[PDB]
């Protein structure tokens, strides 16, 4: 037959890795504005649109994870004093671990939480995470509730829940801060976390989303005209 | 201890690679897999699924419920085509939003003999004969029955069975065709004509309806994975 089908296997269908988020980080004194001394990011896939619609063909799936960090920087003043090289600390935090609350807390000591000290100017960092699903697969599109409001509850605001959410805090957070001190000048930096799946095995395919997304759920608000206009008997 | 040399191509994060990477969470215990039913081993068993195409795209009824059904009547002409569409499986609007289309959006090249299916959902008593034809490209578009019956065609009946099957073969000058509207590599044409008038006895509705399906046989293959256009994000 001589038609190599192996170019479009499942390991090759998710072989290209894409972007998932953009995280800011700044370095100045804490003013009355937004204190961007460090930024937390909720770990999820559904923050872009290249990868969400590419994963949500499939109901159940399990696969190992590989990340990649890309760091760029800028300035804010024209003839700024020439500042030095910087060290960015990407610190992973599982659920239950204490959320950091300032620039230098005791929880930043990475006592057991695995982290990566990254040096600016070198190659992009390249780490791998095994399968951390507590069930036998990850669950795209969970249906039911987390809690059920019973008949003999206290009131209706306690037994209430959120539609289609297995966990309040899905799989932990990231945390990014500059190791170096504050400066009279400031260096705005952006971080683009990439994400490449490996060893992918899926189940139960479903048709892809076509109207644009609206929040983390499955609902929709706008652009309710997915098809164009074209004459019937006319080619 | 070893005379290494930096080859050209260091410190570049290529988005498509299979290098190694250190493990962030060592010594970890993987939850063992179970036998979830419906194990998709390969992407080419999604285009091999019987899926519906939308056909009628007038100004009144596009992006509505009735854009999937085709009205064939008793008062229709015996010398006009019923439905016509060029066979561009990823650029024509009457195929791009099908599951056969929604896989070929992610690819540049494709091949194989895809098979059609139609389904007449009319009454039990009404009969008729419908001729569906294929026309390989390089000629004028077929308009009437006199110039369309020359190519590969199927005299499809309505009395005995209620479902056609048209294995459109693979007649191409190149080996792989493209998935864009390019005039050099064009698919062909598809036209359906009344072989006879729809004989309908009295006390029976006059507006019968016909659906439209699409599929792909086992000789089907793609290559050169890419990203698609149907999703959007204005943010």
């Amino acid at each position: 037959q001589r038609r190599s089908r192996s170019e479009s296997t499942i390991e090759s269908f998710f072989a290209r890795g894409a972007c998932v988020a953009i995280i800011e980080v700044d370095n100045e004194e804490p003013t009355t504005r937004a204190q961007k001394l460090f930024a937390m990011w909720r770990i999820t896939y559904k923050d872009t649109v290249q990868l969400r619609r590419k994963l949500e063909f499939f109901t159940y799936s399990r696969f190992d994870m590989e990340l990649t960090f890309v760091v760029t920087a800028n300035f804010t003043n024209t003839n700024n004093g020439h500042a030095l090289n910087q060290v960015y600390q990407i610190m992973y935090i599982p659920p239950g671990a204490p959320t950091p609350k300032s620039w230098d807390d005791y929880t930043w000591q990475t006592s057991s939480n695995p982290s990566i000290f990254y040096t600016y100017g070198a190659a992009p960092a390249r780490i791998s995470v095994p399968y951390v699903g507590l069930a036998n697969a990850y669950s795209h599109f969970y249906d039911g509730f987390a809690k059920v409001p019973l008949k003999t509850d206290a009131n209706d605001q306690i037994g209430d829940s959120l539609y289609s959410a297995m966990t309040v805090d899905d799989f932990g957070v990231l945390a990014i801060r500059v190791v170096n001190d504050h400066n009279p000048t400031k260096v705005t930096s952006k971080v683009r976390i990439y994400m490449k799946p490996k060893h992918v095995r899926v189940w139960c395919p479903r048709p892809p989303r076509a109207v644009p997304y609206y929040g983390p759920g499955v609902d929709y608000k706008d652009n309710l005209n997915p098809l164009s206009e074209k004459g019937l008997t006319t080619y | 201890g070893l005379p290494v040399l930096n080859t050209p191509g260091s410190n570049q994060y290529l988005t498509s690679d299979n290098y190694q990477s250190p493990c962030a969470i060592p010594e970890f215990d993987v939850t063992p897999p179970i036998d979830i039913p419906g194990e998709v081993k390969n992407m080419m068993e999604l285009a091999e699924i019987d899926t519906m195409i939308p056909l009628n795209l007038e100004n009144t009824k596009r992006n509505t419920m009735d854009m999937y059904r085709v009205t064939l009547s008793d008062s229709a002409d015996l010398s006009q085509p019923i439905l016509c569409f060029s066979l561009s499986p990823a650029s024509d609007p009457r195929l791009s939003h099908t599951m056969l289309g929604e896989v070929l959006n992610y690819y540049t090249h494709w091949a194989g003999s895809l098979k059609f299916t139609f389904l007449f959902c009319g009454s039990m008593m009404a009969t008729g004969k419908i001729l569906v034809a294929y026309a390989p490209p390089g000629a004028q578009p077929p308009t009437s029955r006199k110039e369309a019956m020359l190519g590969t065609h199927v005299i499809w009946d309505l009395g005995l069975q209620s479902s056609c099957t048209m294995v459109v073969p693979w007649i191409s000058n190149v080996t792989y065709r493209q998935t864009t509207q390019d005039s050099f590599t064009e698919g062909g044409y598809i036209s359906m004509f009344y072989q006879t008038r729809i004989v309908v006895p009295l006390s029976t509705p006059k507006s019968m309806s016909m659906l439209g399906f699409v599929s792909a046989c086992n000789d089907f293959s793609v290559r050169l994975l890419r990203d698609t256009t149907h999703i959007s994000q204005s943010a």
Binding site: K198 | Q20, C23, P26, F28, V30
Partner: peptide
């Protein structure tokens, strides 16, 4: 012609396809 493959890590999930 085949090539040379060595999983350089004791971890299993840090390999390639």
């Amino acid at each position: 012609i085949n090539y040379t493959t060595i999983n350089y890590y004791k971890d299993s999930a840090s390999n390639a396809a």
